[PDB]
Structure 1
Amino acid sequence: SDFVVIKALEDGVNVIGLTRGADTRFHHSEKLDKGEVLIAQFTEHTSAIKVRGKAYIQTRHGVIESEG
């Protein structure tokens, strides 16, 4: 099952898990300080992940960068 890597490029990056299912809203927000890395899967409860704030992101389709 797929995962994304998120490296925070500043304090307070917000990695937001959206609920899997007929309804969509966020069910968890994990904040990262600058330099921290989160490696997070798609799961039974999370089917979309949003990143807010400056982050360096890797997925199976390559590198992408969120800007705050």
Structure 2
Amino acid sequence: SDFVVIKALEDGVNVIGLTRGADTRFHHSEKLDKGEVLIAQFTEHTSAIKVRGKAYIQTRHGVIESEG
């Protein structure tokens, strides 16, 4: 099952898990300080992940960068 890597490029990056299912809203927000890395899967409860704030992101389709 797929995962994304998120490296925070500043304090307070917000990695937001959206609920899997007929309804969509966020069910968890994990904040990262600058330099921290989160490696997070798609799961039974999370089917979309949003990143807010400056982050360096890797997925199976390559590198992408969120800007705050």
Q: TM-score, normalised by structure 1?
A: 1.00
Gaps of 5+ in 1: none
Gaps of 5+ in 2: none
Identity %: 100
Q: Give the drift of 1:50.
A: 0.0
Backbone CA RMSD of aligned residues: 0.0
Which 4+ runs in 1 deviate beyond 2 A?
none
Hey, what's the Cα distance between the residues in 2 that align with 1:50 and 1:20? 13
Q: Give the drift of 1:17.
A: 0.0
Hey, what's the Cα distance between the residues in 1 that align with 2:28 and 2:49? 10
SS of corresponding position for 1:65? strand
Q: Give the drift of 1:56.
A: 0.0
Hey, what's the Cα distance between the residues in 1 that align with 2:9 and 2:67? 9
User: What are the superposed Cα offsets for residues 3-49 of structure 1, whole Å, 9 maximum, x if unpaired?
Assistant: 00000000000000000000000000000000000000000000000
Are residue 52 (structure 1) and residue 52 (structure 2) matched?
yes
Q: TM-score, normalised by structure 2?
A: 1.00
